[PDB]
Amino acid sequence: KKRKKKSCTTPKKNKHKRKKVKLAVLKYYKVDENGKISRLRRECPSDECGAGVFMASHFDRHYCGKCCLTYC
Amino acid sequence: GVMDVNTALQEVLKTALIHDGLARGIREAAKALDKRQAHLCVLASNCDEPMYVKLVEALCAEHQINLIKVDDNKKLGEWVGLCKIDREGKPRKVVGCSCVVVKDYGKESQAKDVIEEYFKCKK
């Protein structure tokens, strides 16, 4: 055969660039001037990452990134 | 004991990554503290973030974890090992930490008396 160079496609796909969030640890804990803390993120009851891994506060569900567990 | 606590940090942190017993950085440290698997916490006072020190102190106060300070940020890179070392022994690319938490120690004697007895003195 002979090479025919057809590069035409629906423009070009763009690879998902992640968003650089600064100090994401801040929003998980609410710290007052009295020392006591409040946990603003609901936590997943599992064994692989329990006691420290927070879930996703979406508009209709709670979702753990590591567990892939979703509560609706 | 012949050396003060400012040199115990250069031998307790230098002999703990060999056994992989750290949570270097802030998020690893917070995970370790919430996991009830923290023994020593190290802070640099040079951090100008207001909400950093507050939450770290609050977590280190609610839990019974010893709090330490170094008063310098960048040099902590050599205490942990985030530097590019040269053949002559010149660390050039230095990235310093702000919250390093120990989870385990190694096998040495020089640092087993210097800073490890600086706890009950605060009681």
Ligand SMILES: [Zn+2]
């Ligand atoms: Zn989980």
